[PDB]
Design a protein around this ligand. Structure first.
Ligand SMILES: C/C=C/C/C=C/CCC(=O)[C@@H](O)CC(N)=O
Ligand SMILES: C/C=C/C/C=C/CCC(=O)[C@@H](O)CC(N)=O
Ligand SMILES: [Mn+2]
Ligand SMILES: [Mn+2]
Lengths: 331, 331
């Protein structure tokens, strides 16, 4: 009757399964630079923006014409294995990727079709730039908490190959232009999937509590001043997280953060007093995998045995909108 | 403890507000045909597919370069008026349209930004071809039912102008081709928005109970045989609706159905024994407005005073996937 933060948290939602896919082909920022060099000379720009400003040494790409749906399918088969369950158990499949096969049908239906879901399985895509995978976990969680379903898949496959091809193309023939376009060269390919479940069905599995979102949609227009607005948004979101989840920075064991660039990350972590040792980072070798970044990093943490029962894990990012979301997993 | 269908239904979710926008410019199928005529002669095809096969006499288009977000904004301002509340009350805004402004940010954030939502307002797009507006109502409903929010906006703006321009272009210079492309000429422009609320906050407002989805994602590949699969999917979905909502066709007062074509509609209604007088249809003059079709038709019913307190209203469609959803409003 009297509201409390902890009231809105999910009580019976767990992570049964989690997997990622690393895209196979490494493209180093040096090889890209050698192709851009005549153009750096052209414009008389002496700076290695990628290596030096962004902090990206390499990214991964697909070896072939891999569609988002294919990449999400692969990650999803792995996450079912990780959960030890058959596709027949899945009552919901949400696709959260920025990369998209078609106008329609949803990417989710194509992935469902590949996996062979049953006729009871509800599917749809959620789009929300780099935060969508947290949005999709939350959406699934509400259905689980209510008993509408027992198991859900959240998936995300990202592909950047056509983006890099088109972009390098345009970065060979104006500086406003050449600058606007370098930022596509921080993106990477990859995929993640997660199987979520009612907790009684998966005793001892990691627990998803939910989280908070704040927005500054006044800034939907939109990097100097965008970092600043981002930080101010995150500040507010942290206040929300304190009010709902009871967060204090020092009581969290890991921060799984969406990454835009080494300096944006550096600024975030300084701003909030976070211990950098608690922030795993794949951006320098994998680039920014959009909304798949968070679960990939979470899956990598797991596979490295870097998580312990009881660990409080913070999932967060700042996305275009502007939006910011912060959610907690208790391993 | 013993499950029953009615257990999964929403108890405290209502429709506070509802509005639509008709796009202003009428393009009749005759004017289109006169431009296509040399090409009908060319291919030696004597049939008026649009007028005679599809049953479309006209559609609406925008008069200017209206983006999906602009159209959703307009409909959303109207639906707030209809609900008699300020934007500050909105805790969630979901955009469900097929038409989309950008890769990112979400269309939802752009609409939120235009309206001036508060920093507490969560936003994201849902994509699921023609059923997404029902998906977005369901998503909002779960948050409302739990108490996470008090008011939500679901919005959808559709624009087809560039589609028609590109399509007419290609339909002037091969029959497999010319045929594949005529189906874009059944689309129309328009917009809808709905304000949903916790029932205690809006005493006497129409009640959203929720609904059911079934899928046949084996057919995500995909018209002859697509109508057949559609009907078989809907049959199953009706069985689900009977098990959850207690539906029998004769106890429903209106059917608000997504429309693809006059024959697909005719086949559906015959197949299920529905009284055609209970199926309002705007397709012949407005075309298919995608996922906005359902709420537009619902808003038109309302404005015509065609609904009475206690009326059981069935919201449904068949979408690419294949998917089918069926939900109930009790006016
Ligand atoms: C520390 C502040 C960061 C704000 C950056 C916002 C831009 C983010 C991006 O453009 C992508 O990486 C992610 C996204 N689109 O959501
Ligand atoms: C009566 C059977 C109807 C099945 C038709 C499916 C195709 C539907 C469409 O392509 C659009 O109108 C709607 C959609 N994409 O969801
Ligand atoms: Mn290779
Ligand atoms: Mn006009």
């Amino acid at each position: 009757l009297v509201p409390r933060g902890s009231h809105m948290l999910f009580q019976n939602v767990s992570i049964a399964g989690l997997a990622h896919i690393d895209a196979p082909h490494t493209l180093t920022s040096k090889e890209i630079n050698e192709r851009l060099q005549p153009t750096y000379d052209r414009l008389g720009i002496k700076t290695d923006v990628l290596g030096d400003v962004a902090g990206i040494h390499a990214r991964r790409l697909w070896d072939q014409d891999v569609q988002a749906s294919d990449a999400a399918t692969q990650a999803a088969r792995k996450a079912l294995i990780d959960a030890n369950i058959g596709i027949e158990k899945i009552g919901l499949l949400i696709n959260t990727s920025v990369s998209r096969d078609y106008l329609q049908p949803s990417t989710a239906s194509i992935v469902s079709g590949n996996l062979g879901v049953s006729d009871h399985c509800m599917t749809f895509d959620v789009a929300n730039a780099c935060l969508a995978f947290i949005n999709g976990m939350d959406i699934a969680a509400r259905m689980l908490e209510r008993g509408e379903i027992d198991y859900a898949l959240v998936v995300d496959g990202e592909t950047a190959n056509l983006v890099y091809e088109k972009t390098l193309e345009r970065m060979t023939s104006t500086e406003e232009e050449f600058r606007n376009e370098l930022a596509a060269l921080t993106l990477g390919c990859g995929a993640a999937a997660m199987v979520m479940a009612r907790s009684e069905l998966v005793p001892d599995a990691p627990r998803y509590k939910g989280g908070v979102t704040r927005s500054a949609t006044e800034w939907n227009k939109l990097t100097r001043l965008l970092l600043i607005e981002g930080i101010k948004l995150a500040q507010k979101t942290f206040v929300a997280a304190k009010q709902v989840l009871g967060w204090a920075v020092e009581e969290l064991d890991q921060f799984v953060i969406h990454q835009v660039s080494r300096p944006h990350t550096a600024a975030f972590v300084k701003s909030f007093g976070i211990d950098p040792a608690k922030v795993m980072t794949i951006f320098g070798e994998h680039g920014n995998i959009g909304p798949a970044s968070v679960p990939i990093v979470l899956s990598k943490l797991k596979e490295l045995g870097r998580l312990k029962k009881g660990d409080r894990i913070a999932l967060l990012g700042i996305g275009s909108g502007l939006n910011c979301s912060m959610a907690e997993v208790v391993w």
